[PDB]
Scaffold this active site. Structure first.
Site: not given
Ligand SMILES: Nc1nc2c(ncn2[C@@H]2O[C@H](COP(=O)(O)OP(=O)(O)OP(=O)(O)O)[C@@H](O)[C@H]2O)c(=O)[nH]1
Ligand SMILES: [Mg+2]
Ligand SMILES: Nc1nc2c(ncn2[C@@H]2O[C@H](COP(=O)(O)OP(=O)(O)O)[C@@H](O)[C@H]2O)c(=O)[nH]1
Lengths: 48, 430, 52, 427
Positions: B10, B90, B134, B245
């Site tokens: 993701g 997704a 996500g 460990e």
């Molecule tokens: N801490 C942190 N969280 C991130 C970062 N990039 C994305 N996220 C987290 O990713 C979550 C959702 O990611 P998405 O890209 O929208 O969804 P996905 O997991 O890639 O799956 P899809 O719905 O198909 O896009 C969000 O709640 C963000 O908090 C990052 O660089 N740092």
């Molecule tokens: Mg995503």
């Protein structure tokens, strides 16, 4: 006993001398390489 | 010789990975091209002339973030076959990533991971990252873990995932994906570390003068924690600690594996000159709820297992003094049936910093991992939110139409409930 | 024994040449392939300018 | 001709043994490469006891190093005396230690032992005579505990006559390095009671206390702690290498100090230890050494003798001193403190005087004692093991390896029986 302790103290100073080189080398070589990996590698990305 | 495979899923996994590899290449000193101007096998793999290749696979169903790395400055470091990008994401749908889209690309990724492991004879475990809220992150993570359970059997499948924040949320359907992932993770995952975005946001200003951080600053804090975890496997130390460990000591039961994470001292580049940062200061400040990366107060729960990992000028005498003083704190409670509850490990290599950066030149640092019953606080909120959603059938039609059967939702609800009772039963005294 | 120590040195040098052969040749082949694209600059950009 | 074979296991054992070989090599006067450049002829008389000679004027020690993970030996080979050990004496697998006793005993212990016994046999029959084996291992961890117990059982199977003298570190009660340490200590005790003849145990918290109280070590590392264990190691076997006014080997010590087959666990102490700044105020004499030796604050075991009673004791001396003075002090210390000695065994103190003092110290002595204070050490682990065993928590991890849950009950029952045996012999 003390007659041989006169030689004994010199030899203890020799053991202290060996400890001096060993610890000093372990510290001086460690610190500068540590700074290089952190800071010199850092400087490249600052320009980037 | 001895090795860890990194798998990223993701958007968060790729962006978190990008920050981590920035730290790793600097900390060993490998140029972005893989050349030079050790324990490389831990994360780096070696090729013909001088080029180094990282033991990572970047997986995403959306090509946008992957194409950034392909165009980015680090494009030459990674092998093109390691960067797999899908066609369409997704869409924040667990069912879509689990059944429709994820199963299209699943076979390609597994072959790439298995092929990498052949060069990695010294395998000890896999590190995998996900987003709980996500769709691709949680949805594809479930299928990948399920396949790897039978592919490799007894291998440490450690994880580091971003749990939804207690109040801050950027997805309406977030509770559905989290409850569905939680059912999948709790069975197969050996030990999955937890962090949340909201506490990371709060610390990024409270611990250091940054008024409005971004995902970049948060990723650097995550990379620092991962570096300390793998620091013992990369450098000499007075107390070597391996993955097995951690696995034996941290978890007392199968389903109570979920630990919490902490790090200290996190301090701006200017304030570090005012304070000594002795071993007592770094050890004492770890237990404060302000430094917790998961917004659950330890005073609500109890402590059953703790691990301390030190990097710097640490002397073993001060560690014993610091731990003894901690046990005298009446504010900290421990389960009676676990009197010791501490494993500490000492490594000589200090932390490494990154420019345009947030941390300081701390001489000595320490990483803290623990398991607490305070995590039950977080679960109850997720259960309550899901019940409000499913009471009126808020978003059932989206998930059902993507091939997922409706009978799973009560099943996953029961699994979360059983975990809640299990945590309560363990926390009970006798 | 020292004689085979230099014999081991010969093996190390040969195994170094093994990597050097790939190290230099494969880089050169890519440079030629880039220049093939430089040929593609004129067989396409100017030829399709003639198409214009 | 009383060669002693040295065996090391685990990170803790290998580092301590490495420091041991530095001290014994310096005592004889051997260069790190194995060639002699010493200063006295008496050094060569019985160098065979711990070394083999490689034709060319090079000495190879009778040492074997074993670890489940390869990390520790990297430091050992990089050490000052790394080249001294035989390259084929390094036996190791390629799996993590795991900090699990059951894993270290059944999963990796079986595979490693088949390789290890051949090296031990090759080292054992290389000498004309072999009085007994010598082992350093850690009870707290997984590798040193399980592998040490398995190798001790196998050696007892093969060499019943030889004296299996072992050195171990008991997990510290207050601040120790392992969460699951009481499980490993409890399991290791069962085999250790029935197999080993002579046992010595060290507490790390006692080491920190001794180092800070006496030597004023502002930054006590593991080196000084490992160094102190070395003098205890060197003074134990000093009689075999050099002459003196009264000879005493391991078998003499075992017969004198062990009254019953199940009471053989010992505590150790070394003297004199003086502050490096104020060492030039001490007119060290035999009465001063006896005061330092018999003092509770200089004991390397975290158990106060005053809380219990003594059964047998022995003191080994080094240097040129009067035999009458040692006897008179020994009688005086027995008569003055009769509250701590059993009435049915008179003359509980045995003496032994070697002639040559160690380097750096014009005269020295070593103490080994046996007492009923051992119950406190067993009390701490018993209470901790019961707390761990109450809620069935970490039984899960040991189940996946093959260990049966009933083994904990058998081990605790055996250790509790040892506690009772020490209790009823107090009368
Ligand atoms: N801490 C942190 N969280 C991130 C970062 N990039 C994305 N996220 C987290 O990713 C979550 C959702 O990611 P998405 O890209 O929208 O969804 P996905 O997991 O890639 O799956 P899809 O719905 O198909 O896009 C969000 O709640 C963000 O908090 C990052 O660089 N740092
Ligand atoms: Mg995503
Ligand atoms: N005195 C001393 N103790 C050590 C040393 N190295 C490790 N230890 C202690 O030994 C314990 C771990 O022993 P270890 O060798 O890992 O046991 P194993 O896993 O069974 O081999 C820890 O509590 C350490 O504090 C050392 O060099 N000296």
């Amino acid at each position: 006993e003390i007659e041989r302790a006169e030689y004994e103290r010199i030899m203890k100073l020799a053991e202290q001398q060996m400890d001096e080189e060993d610890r000093r080398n372990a510290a001086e070589k460690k610190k500068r390489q540590e700074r290089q990996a952190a800071i010199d590698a850092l400087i490249e990305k600052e320009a980037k | 010789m001895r090795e860890v495979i990194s798998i990223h899923v993701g958007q968060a996994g790729v962006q978190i990975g990008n920050g981590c590899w920035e730290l790793y290449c600097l900390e060993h000193g490998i140029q972005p091209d893989g050349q030079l101007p050790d324990a490389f096998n831990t994360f780096f793999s070696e090729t013909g002339a001088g080029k180094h290749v990282p033991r990572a696979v970047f997986v995403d169903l959306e090509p946008t973030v992957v194409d950034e790395v392909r165009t980015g400055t680090y494009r030459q470091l990674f092998h093109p076959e390691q960067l797999i990008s899908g066609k369409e994401d997704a869409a924040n749908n667990y069912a879509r990533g689990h059944y429709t889209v994820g199963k299209e690309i699943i076979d390609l990724t597994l072959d790439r991971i298995r092929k990498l492991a052949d060069q990695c004879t010294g395998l000890q475990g896999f590190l995998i990252f996900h987003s709980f809220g996500g769709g691709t992150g949680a949805g594809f993570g479930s299928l990948l873990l399920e396949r790897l359970s039978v592919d490799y059997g007894k291998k440490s499948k450690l994880e580091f995932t971003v749990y939804p924040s207690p109040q801050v949320s950027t997805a309406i359907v977030e509770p559905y994906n989290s409850i569905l992932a939680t059912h999948s993770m709790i069975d197969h995952s050996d030990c999955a570390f937890m962090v949340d975005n909201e506490a990371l946001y709060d610390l990024c200003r409270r611990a250091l003068d940054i008024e409005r951080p971004t995902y970049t600053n948060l990723n650097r804090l995550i990379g620092q924690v991962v570096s300390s975890l793998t620091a013992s496997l990369r450098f000499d130390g007075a107390l070597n600690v391996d993955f097995t460990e951690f696995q034996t000591n941290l978890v007392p039961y199968a389903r109570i594996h979920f630990p919490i994470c902490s790090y200290a001292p996190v301090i701006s580049a200017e304030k570090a000159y005012h304070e000594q940062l002795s071993v007592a200061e770094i050890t004492n400040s770890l237990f404060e709820p302000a430094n917790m990366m998961v917004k659950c107060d330890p005073r609500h729960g109890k402590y059953m297992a703790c691990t301390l990992l030190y990097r710097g000028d640490v002397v073993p005498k001060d560690v014993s003094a610091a731990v003894a003083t901690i046990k005298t704190k009446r504010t900290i409670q421990f389960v009676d049936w676990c009197p010791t509850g501490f494993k500490m490990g000492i490594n000589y290599q200090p932390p490494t910093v990154v420019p345009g950066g947030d941390l300081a030149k701390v001489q000595r640092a320490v990483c803290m991992l623990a398991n607490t019953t305070a995590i039950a606080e977080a679960w109850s909120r997720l259960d309550h939110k899901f019940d409000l959603m499913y009471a009126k059938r808020a978003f059932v039609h989206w998930y059902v139409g993507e091939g997922m059967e409706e009978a799973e939702f009560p099943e996953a609800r029961e699994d979360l409930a059983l975990l809640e009772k299990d945590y309560d039963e363990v926390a009970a005294e006798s | 024994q020292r004689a085979k120590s230099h014999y081991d040195e010969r093996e190390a040098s040969l195994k170094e040449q093994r990597r050097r052969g790939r190290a230099i040749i494969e880089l050169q082949i890519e440079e030629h392939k880039i220049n093939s694209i430089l040929e593609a600059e004129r067989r396409d950009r100017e030829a399709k300018a003639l198409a214009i | 001709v009383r060669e002693i074979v040295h065996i090391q296991a685990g990170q803790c054992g290998n580092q301590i043994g490495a420091k041991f070989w530095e001290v014994i090599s310096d005592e004889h006067g051997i260069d790190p490469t194995g060639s002699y450049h010493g200063d006295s002829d008496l050094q060569l008389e019985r160098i065979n006891v711990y070394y083999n000679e490689a034709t060319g004027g090079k000495y190879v020690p009778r040492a074997i190093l074993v670890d489940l993970e390869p990390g520790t030996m990297d430091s050992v080979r990089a050490g000052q005396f790394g080249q001294l050990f035989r390259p084929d004496n390094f036996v190791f697998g390629q799996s993590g230690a795991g900090n699990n006793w059951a894993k270290g005993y059944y999963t990796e212990g079986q595979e490693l032992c088949e390789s290890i016994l051949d090296v031990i046999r090759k080292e054992a029959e290389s000498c004309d005579c072999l009085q007994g084996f010598q082992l350093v291992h850690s009870l707290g961890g997984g590798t040193g505990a399980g592998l040490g117990t398995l190798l001790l059982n196998k050696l007892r199977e093969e060499y019943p006559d030889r004296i299996l003298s072992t050195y171990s570190i008991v997990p510290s009660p207050k601040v120790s390095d392992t969460v699951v340490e009481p499980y490993n200590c409890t399991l290791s005790v069962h085999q250790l009671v029935e197999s080993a003849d002579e046992v010595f145990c060290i507490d790390n918290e006692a080491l920190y206390d001794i180092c800070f109280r006496t030597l004023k070590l502002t930054t006590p590392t593991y080196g000084d702690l490992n160094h102190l264990v070395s003098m205890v190691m060197s003074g134990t076997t000093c009689a075999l290498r050099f002459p003196g006014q009264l000879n005493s080997d391991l078998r003499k010590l075992a017969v004198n100090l062990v009254p019953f087959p199940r009471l053989h666990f010992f505590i150790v102490g070394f003297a004199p230890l003086t502050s490096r700044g104020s060492q030039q105020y001490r007119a060290l004499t035999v009465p001063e050494l006896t005061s330092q030796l018999f003092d509770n604050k200089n004991m390397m075991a975290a158990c106060d003798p005053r809380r219990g009673v003594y059964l047998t004791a022995s003191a080994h001396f080094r240097g040129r001193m009067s035999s009458k003075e040692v006897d008179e002090q020994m009688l005086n210390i027995q008569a003055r403190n009769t509250s701590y000695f059993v009435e049915w065994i008179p003359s509980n103190v045995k003496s032994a005087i070697c002639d040559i003092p160690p380097r750096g110290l014009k005269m020295a002595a070593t103490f080994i004692g046996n007492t009923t204070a051992f119950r406190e050490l067993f009390t701490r682990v018993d209470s901790q093991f019961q707390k761990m065993y109450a809620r069935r928590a970490f039984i899960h991890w040991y189940v996946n390896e093959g260990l049966e849950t009933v083994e904990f009950d058998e081990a605790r029952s055996n250790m509790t029986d040892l506690i009772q045996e020490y209790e009823m012999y107090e009368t």
